[PDB]
Each structure stands twice: as C-alpha cells, then as structure tokens.
Paper text:
IL-18/IL-18Rα/IL-18Rβ ternary complex formation juxtaposes the intracellular Toll-Interleukin-1 receptor domains of IL-18Rα and IL-18Rβ, to which the adaptor molecule myeloid differentiation factor 88 (MyD88) is recruited presumably with the aid of TRAM6.
Within IL-18Rα, D1 extensively contacts D2, whereas D3 is distant and is connected by the long D2-D3 linker, which implies that D1 and D2 behave as a single module, similar to IL-1-related primary receptors. IL-18Rα recognizes IL-18 through a large interaction surface area at ~1,850 Å2. In both the binary and ternary complexes, the segment between residues 35 and 40 adopts an α-helix structure with a cis Ala42IL-18-Pro43IL-18 bond, which is stabilized by hydrogen bonds and electrostatic interactions with IL-18Rα. Surrounding Site I, α-helix I mediated the interaction, wherein the Arg25Rα side chain is buried within the β3-α1 acidic groove of IL-18. Around Site II, the IL-18Rα acidic surface, which is composed of the Glu253Rα and Glu263Rα carboxylates as well as Trp249Rα backbone oxygen, captures the Lys53IL-18 ε-amino group.
Residue numbers in the entry:
A (entry chain B): -1, 20 to 48, 52 to 315
B (entry chain A): 1 to 156
Write the structure that this text describes.
Amino acid sequence: PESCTSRPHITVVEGEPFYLKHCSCSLAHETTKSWYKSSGSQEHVELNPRSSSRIALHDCVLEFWPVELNDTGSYFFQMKNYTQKWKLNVIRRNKHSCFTERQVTSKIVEVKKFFQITCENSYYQTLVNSTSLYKNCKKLLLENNKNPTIKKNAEFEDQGYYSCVHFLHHNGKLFNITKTFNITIVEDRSNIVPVLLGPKLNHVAVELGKNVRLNCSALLNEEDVIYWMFGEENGSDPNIHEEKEMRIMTPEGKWHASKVLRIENIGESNLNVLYNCTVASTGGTDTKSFILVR
Amino acid sequence: YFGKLESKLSVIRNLNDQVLFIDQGNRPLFEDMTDSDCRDNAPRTIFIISMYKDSQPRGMAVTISVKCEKISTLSCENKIISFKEMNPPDNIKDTKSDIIFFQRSVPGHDNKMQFESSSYEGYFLACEKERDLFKLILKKEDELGDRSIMFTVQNE
Ligand SMILES: *[C@@H]1O[C@H](CO)[C@@H](O[C@@H]2O[C@H](CO)[C@@H](O[C@@H]3O[C@H](CO[C@H]4O[C@H](CO[C@H]5O[C@H](CO)[C@@H](O)[C@H](O)[C@@H]5O)[C@@H](O)[C@H](O)[C@@H]4O)[C@@H](O)[C@H](O[C@H]4O[C@H](CO)[C@@H](O)[C@H](O)[C@@H]4O)[C@@H]3O)[C@H](O)[C@H]2NC(C)=O)[C@H](O)[C@H]1NC(C)=O
Ligand SMILES: *[C@@H]1O[C@H](CO)[C@@H](O[C@@H]2O[C@H](CO)[C@@H](O[C@@H]3O[C@H](CO)[C@@H](O)[C@H](O)[C@@H]3O)[C@H](O)[C@H]2NC(C)=O)[C@H](O)[C@H]1NC(C)=O
Ligand SMILES: *[C@@H]1O[C@H](CO[C@@H]2O[C@@H](C)[C@@H](O)[C@@H](O)[C@@H]2O)[C@@H](O[C@@H]2O[C@H](CO)[C@@H](O)[C@H](O)[C@H]2NC(C)=O)[C@H](O)[C@H]1NC(C)=O
Ligand SMILES: *[C@@H]1O[C@H](CO[C@@H]2O[C@@H](C)[C@@H](O)[C@@H](O)[C@@H]2O)[C@@H](O[C@@H]2O[C@H](CO)[C@@H](O)[C@H](O)[C@H]2NC(C)=O)[C@H](O)[C@H]1NC(C)=O
Ligand SMILES: *[C@@H]1O[C@H](CO)[C@@H](O[C@@H]2O[C@H](CO)[C@@H](O)[C@H](O)[C@H]2NC(C)=O)[C@H](O)[C@H]1NC(C)=O
Ligand SMILES: *[C@@H]1O[C@H](CO)[C@@H](O)[C@H](O)[C@H]1NC(C)=O
Ligand SMILES: *[C@@H]1O[C@H](CO)[C@@H](O)[C@H](O)[C@H]1NC(C)=O
C-alpha cells in the first residue's frame, strides 16, 4: 500500500522510527533477499533478524526502532538480480525545539489562496495512538486526534512551522514521527496576459543602404520572454542584429519590456519581408509583424 | 523552427508536492522530499528548463534537462519518456520536436503548469503511480481538470 523509498539519499532525525522500503514488492513473493550496511569505509556487513535489537528485517522493508546516529551509512538491498542502494544520513535531534530545523519541507503559499495541512502517516497508522499538530511548537486545537487538518484561505499570520507529531507504541516503548512544514505566506503574484504594445502590422519606410531600428515593446510578467524572428534557420542576414532587452517595472510590479531589431545596410532582401516580434509566457503568446518598404 | 534563448534551474513537483528526480537507473520519478533531501539528492532533483523561440508561437517552448556525470535532455520519442544523453540544442529546424514541450499554466491557476508535447498534440507530461513508484510519463489529456498533468516549477 505504501510507496517504495526510491530516492538515493535519505535524511532522518535520531530517535524516530524509520524504514526504507525497496522497489520490488510484487517481486518479493517468488529467503533470496538480503540487506547490507556499509559504515565509513567498512566495505559492507550483512544485516540479520537480530543484528541489532532496533533493526527489524522484512521482505520489502528494513525497519529501525528507532533510528539512531550510529545508523548513518550506506545501505544495499539484493534480491536475486535486483539491487538497490540508499545513503542514510541520521541527523542529531534538536532537543530544545519540538522539531529539528534541518528536517523541514518548505511551502510558499500566496495570500488569500487555499491553504491546507493534513497529518497522515500511511505506514505506521496501525501503531499510531494519537497524532497532534503544532504551529511553532504550540499545540493547535483541531478536533481530530487521528488526522488533524487545517483548511483555510491563507493569511500572512498563517506563516510558520507546522509540525505533525504521530505518537505510537512498539513493544511498550512510546515513539513519535515528527514532520514539519515551513509555510511562507507571500503577496499575490497576480500574473497578467502579456500584451504587445502598438499595431499588429507595421509598415516602416526605409531607404536602401541605410540602417533601421525596429522597436518592439510589451507589457509582460517577470518570467516572460520577448524575441524577434528574422530568419535565423540556416544563418540570418549578417546585417540583422537583435539588441539587448530593456525592462522598466510598472507601479503594479509588472514589466515594460523593449527589444530592438537593428537592420543595418538595408537591401532588397529586407524589403517585403515580415520581421516578427513575439512575447511568450506560460499565460499565452502574442506576435506583431514589421514590413520594410521603400 | 526553434532557437535556444535562455536556461534556468528549477525544481519540478507534482500537485502532491513530490519532487521529480532522475534515479540511479536514469528513470524520471516522483518522491516526497524534505528541503534537505531535495538538496542532498541534487543534481538529480535540479532540472535545467531552457526557453526557445518558436517560428509559430503556441505557448512557452521549453526543454527539460538534467546535469549529472553527463547532461541529459527529456525526450518523449515514440510516446515513451526517456532522458537522452545530449545538451539542449542551439537550433531545431522543425515545428515539432520530441524534446520541445509547451509550458502552459492552467486557466485560473497561474502556478499549476502543464507541458504539452510539440510532436504529439494533446499529449502531456504526467505523474502516474506504477506499482510502488511514481513515474514521469506521457499521457493523452482525457478528462478536463486532470491533476496528474499539472506541476509546479520552483526557481532559484
Ligand atoms: C518525539 O520523541 C523524541 C524522542 O524520541 C522526544 O525527544 C525529547 O524531547 C525533549 C524536549 O522536547 C528533550 O528534553 C529536553 O532536554 C534538554 C537537554 O537535555 C540534556 O540533559 C539531559 C539530562 O538528563 C536528564 O534525563 C535523564 C534521563 O535520560 C534524567 O535521569 C535526568 O534527571 C535529566 O532529567 C540529558 O539526558 C540529555 O541527553 C541532554 O544532554 C533540556 O534542556 C530540556 O529542558 C526543558 O525542561 C526543563 C525541565 O525539565 C525546563 O526547565 C527547560 O526550560 C526546558 O523546557 C528538555 O528536558 C529530550 O531529551 C528528548 N529526548 C530524546 C531521546 O531526544 C520528543 O520530545 C518527542 N516529541 C514530542 C512532541 O513528544
Ligand atoms: C525606434 O526608436 C528610436 C528611438 O529609440 C528611433 O530613433 C530615433 O530616430 C530619429 C530619426 O528617425 C532620430 O532623431 C533625429 O535624427 C538625427 C539623425 O542624424 C539624430 O542625430 C537626432 O537625434 C535627430 O533628432 C533619433 O536620434 C533616433 N534615436 C535613436 C536612439 O536612435 C527610431 O526611429 C524608431 N524606429 C522606428 C522604426 O520608428
Ligand atoms: C493509547 O494507548 C493506551 C494504552 O497504551 C498502553 O501503555 C503504553 C505506555 C504502552 O505500554 C502500550 O503498549 C500500552 O498498550 C490506550 O489506553 C487503554 O485504552 C482503553 C480503552 O480503549 C482503556 O479502557 C484502558 O484503561 C487503557 N489501558 C492502558 C493500559 O492505558 C489508549 O486508549 C490509546 N489511545 C488512543 C487514542 O488510541
Ligand atoms: C513572420 O510571421 C509571418 C506570419 O505568420 C503567421 O503568424 C505567426 C505568429 C505564426 O503563427 C505563423 O504560423 C503564421 O503563419 C510568417 O509567414 C508565414 O509563414 C508560414 C511558414 O513559413 C506560412 O505557412 C504562412 O503562409 C506565412 N504567412 C504569411 C502571411 O506570409 C513569417 O514566415 C514570419 N517571419 C519570419 C522571419 O519567421
Ligand atoms: C523557511 O522558508 C523560507 C522561505 O523559503 C526560508 O527563508 C529563506 O532563507 C534563505 C537563507 O536560508 C534566504 O536567502 C531567503 O531570502 C529566505 N526567503 C525568505 C522569503 O525569507 C527559511 O530559511 C526556511 N526555514 C528553514 C528552517 O528552512
Ligand atoms: C547505537 O547508539 C545507541 C545510542 O544512540 C546505543 O544505545 C546502541 O547500543 C548503539 N548500537 C551500536 C551497534 O553501536
Ligand atoms: C533481472 O533478470 C531479468 C531476467 O531474468 C531481467 O529481465 C531484468 O531486467 C533483471 N533486472 C535488473 C534490475 O537487471
């Protein structure tokens, strides 16, 4: 039911029940499976049912009850020809806080947008007696003891460290699985549809042998691009130069972007040719064309 | 025609906040990761999103790449997702490409991102649970409002 630990490097806090599940559980159905540990250049050792009173070896998982600092090391699993490696990094517990800062999952939420925190632990839920949710180590009162859940529209005051603490029993001993979320409330990014300023079709009167600077400007978002299409497929006209972009922030925090196409030494090859300027965004694109005329 | 513009470093995550990463077997996978885990697994978790100029604009034309012992680029050749050992090209002399995707935010959710294939129209980059794994796959849109084809890109 629970997903395998497929990532190569794992970071866990000491004194917390930890496990690593391999990615061949259906395979673990066909005694031909082994787990190994390699401490700082120890060239591995095979783990066994009672290698350590804390380490429980199962067909698909390697359980730690709890994981401690001496467990830091490289772990290797072998089933017939299947092989899996994990680099376990057990970090010291911040015994002055209700959670270690080095074990947080940050999340940035825009103000007034939906915000939700749910405490769940699929794996150990059978052993979980109670689970509590704290905001900056202050127990919040959300009726639910099984899955304390916050569901609201974000406010700047919601910024803070939300720690899910799952309390559980294993052979009389009490343990917990703390999982902290570093929520950061930010101002609404309020993205706009990029718009090219000026008419879609532009005719600019030029004279052969002279130069021309085709100005293109748009109103766009910080991450949008403005570019020119002037026939670079197998090399463009060597006299055509796309100038550096220019951006001025609008009071509303959007951007006035400018890109100039410089057509030097104008010839008949530049005339009655559509030079296009496009603005492209995750929110849409828009193109305008320039025609050089005599 | 596509022309390489600029590249950025990004952390791609599904709508369940699971970090996309290329595993030891060079397969693109999705896993829950604490900030530390995301950093300690870098560069496997850091993707190079490269913008391209398009001859016929139809959204933000990008290539997803990863820099390990070698630079690999995400390809959806034959509707099958793979990481081809290659750098994002300077030029592409076609209107369609197995490595070019159209990054589009979802209507009403400017942070939720979809990647449409330039070669297979209506085929999107998606997160699918296969056995005990979350895999990056190419999927046809199907029902409108499909959260599996939606992602979030976090920049540095
Ligand atoms: C999830 O599980 C983990 C364990 O798996 C829980 O972790 C525990 O967290 C608490 C704090 O939340 C820690 O206590 C604090 O320890 C600080 C430093 O302690 C040092 O000195 C200790 C001295 O010996 C004491 O313990 C022995 C028994 O072992 C007794 O015989 C002896 O009389 C002493 O009481 C060392 O043992 C220890 O190793 C450290 O070097 C303290 O600074 C801190 O003080 C608070 O309490 C004071 C009153 O007692 C108060 O005046 C202070 O202001 C301050 O608030 C506190 O005692 C545990 O050490 C820690 N255990 C482990 C194993 O990590 C975690 O709490 C749990 N999560 C939840 C939410 O329940
Ligand atoms: C694109 O915008 C630029 C401005 O950023 C326009 O350039 C300006 O062009 C005029 C003439 O067309 C220049 O003014 C006059 O011309 C003489 C030429 O000898 C010049 O020395 C004097 O300044 C004079 O007032 C102006 O200098 C020039 N500015 C720049 C920065 O080049 C350009 O015309 C616009 N392009 C199009 C297609 O409209
Ligand atoms: C949480 O667990 C207690 C029982 O835990 C016991 O004590 C621990 C320290 C450890 O030794 C465990 O292995 C023990 O099982 C539950 O308390 C019992 O609940 C019944 C009702 O269901 C009550 O009538 C008994 O008096 C309790 N017995 C004891 C020994 O405390 C408690 O209900 C559990 N909490 C939740 C919310 O599930
Ligand atoms: C500049 O743009 C013209 C017009 O292109 C149209 O608008 C674009 C934004 C894009 O959506 C195109 O697909 C549209 O056709 C380009 O001219 C077209 O080129 C295509 C392919 O060569 C051709 O099928 C159309 O018939 C052409 N239409 C016209 C009006 O000529 C032109 O090629 C672009 N210029 C450069 C330098 O790339
Ligand atoms: C909680 O999240 C915030 C936002 O991601 C982190 O703040 C950043 O911290 C770095 C330095 O560590 C600064 O360079 C950034 O400018 C900060 N960003 C903001 C918006 O303040 C914060 O460090 C996180 N906390 C933990 C413990 O990881
Ligand atoms: C591991 O460390 C714990 C204390 O953190 C200790 O009780 C235990 O005996 C150690 N085991 C080994 C094999 O080093
Ligand atoms: C294991 O062996 C089978 C053939 O018996 C093969 O198809 C499979 O790819 C192998 N697994 C790995 C991880 O190499």
